[PDB]
Amino acid sequence: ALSPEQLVLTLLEAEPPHVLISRPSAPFTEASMMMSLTKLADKELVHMISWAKKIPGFVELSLFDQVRLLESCWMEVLMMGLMWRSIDHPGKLIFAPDLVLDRDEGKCVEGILEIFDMLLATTSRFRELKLQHKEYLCVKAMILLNSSMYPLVTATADSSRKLAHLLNAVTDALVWVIAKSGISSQQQSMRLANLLMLLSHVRHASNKGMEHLLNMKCKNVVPVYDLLLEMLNAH
Amino acid sequence: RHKILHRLLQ
Numbered sequence: 715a716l717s718p719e720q721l722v723l724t725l726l727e728a729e730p731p732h733v734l735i736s737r738p739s740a741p742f743t744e745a746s747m748m749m750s751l752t753k754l755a756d757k758e759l760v761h762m763i764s765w766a767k768k769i770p771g772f773v774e775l776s777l778f779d780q781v782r783l784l785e786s787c788w789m790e791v792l793m794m795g796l797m798w799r800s801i802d803h804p805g806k807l808i809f810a811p812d813l814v815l816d817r818d819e820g821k822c823v824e825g826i827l828e829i830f831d832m833l834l835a836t837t838s839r840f841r842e843l844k845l846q847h848k849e850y851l852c853v854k855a856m857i858l859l860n861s862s863m864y865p866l867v868t869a870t871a872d873s874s875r876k877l878a879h880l881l882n883a884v885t886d887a888l889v890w891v892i893a894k895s896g897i898s899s900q901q902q903s904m905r906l907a908n909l910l911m912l913l914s915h916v917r918h919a920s921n922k923g924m925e926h927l928l929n930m931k932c933k934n935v936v937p938v939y940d941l942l943l944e945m946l947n948a949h
Numbered sequence: 950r951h952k953i954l955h956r957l958l959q
């Protein structure tokens with residue numbers, strides 16, 4: 715199940731559905747643009763839980779570690795999906811098939827234009843590298859499995875070893891996919907380093923987005939509900 | 950606290 719060709723096919727079959735949403739009838743305001751983006755995020759979070767349960771070994775971790783990994787990565791995983799949907803469309807963010815925002819539309823919401831420019835620049839670096847679909851599947855699974863999991867004290871020890879074995883198997887799978895290209899050994903090491911250095915850019919953008927959303931919530935610009943509200947209250 | 954996520958995990 716963890717051998718490279720079987721693991722990559724399992725990740726391919728686990729991909730979540732595209733969630734559909736459209737623009738409002740009236741011109742956007744700061745409040746109505748925040749309402750459309752947060753309604754989409756809440757529904758994608760529900761499907762994200764079903765995706766994580768499909769990754770081999772994940773439901774064999776402690777329930778406590780399952781919850782802690784999703785709390786630590788959910789905004790990063792929403793942004794990685796958006797970047798892959800937008801990779802062939804310079805100057806646009808493809809939130810859904812009927813919600814395609816031009817860069818300049820971020821001028822509608824205070825503080826969001828900087829975050830759109832971060833997302834668009836990291837999308838442009840994956841376009842320049844010619845990121846392949848099977849490389850994307852491995853890097854998105856590494857985002858889930860790679861957070862700090864500094865020791866905490868639970869009322870109830872193999873769950874950490876189980877996590878390292880799973881993260882090692884996904885890393886081996888990405889090295890196997892790169893080796894199909896047949897480029898030089900130096901070029902394979904350089905491509906691996908280039909893809910993994912972009913993980914810090916996805917964490918940077920997710921930090922700025924989490925601050926922005928918590929401030930829009932506190933100031934009553936947008937109301938938030940159910941799963942999205944719970945993940946924010948817990949942060 | 951993690952009230953609704955537990956529910957979807959099981």
Ligand SMILES: C[C@]12CC[C@@H]3c4ccc(O)cc4CC[C@H]3[C@@H]1CC[C@@H]2O
Nearest residue numbers: 751754755792793796829923926927
């Ligand atoms: C979290 C925000 C609303 C939801 C947005 C979203 C919504 C859905 C999705 O697939 C990706 C993203 C990334 C950008 C996010 C925004 C950045 C700041 C804003 O508050």
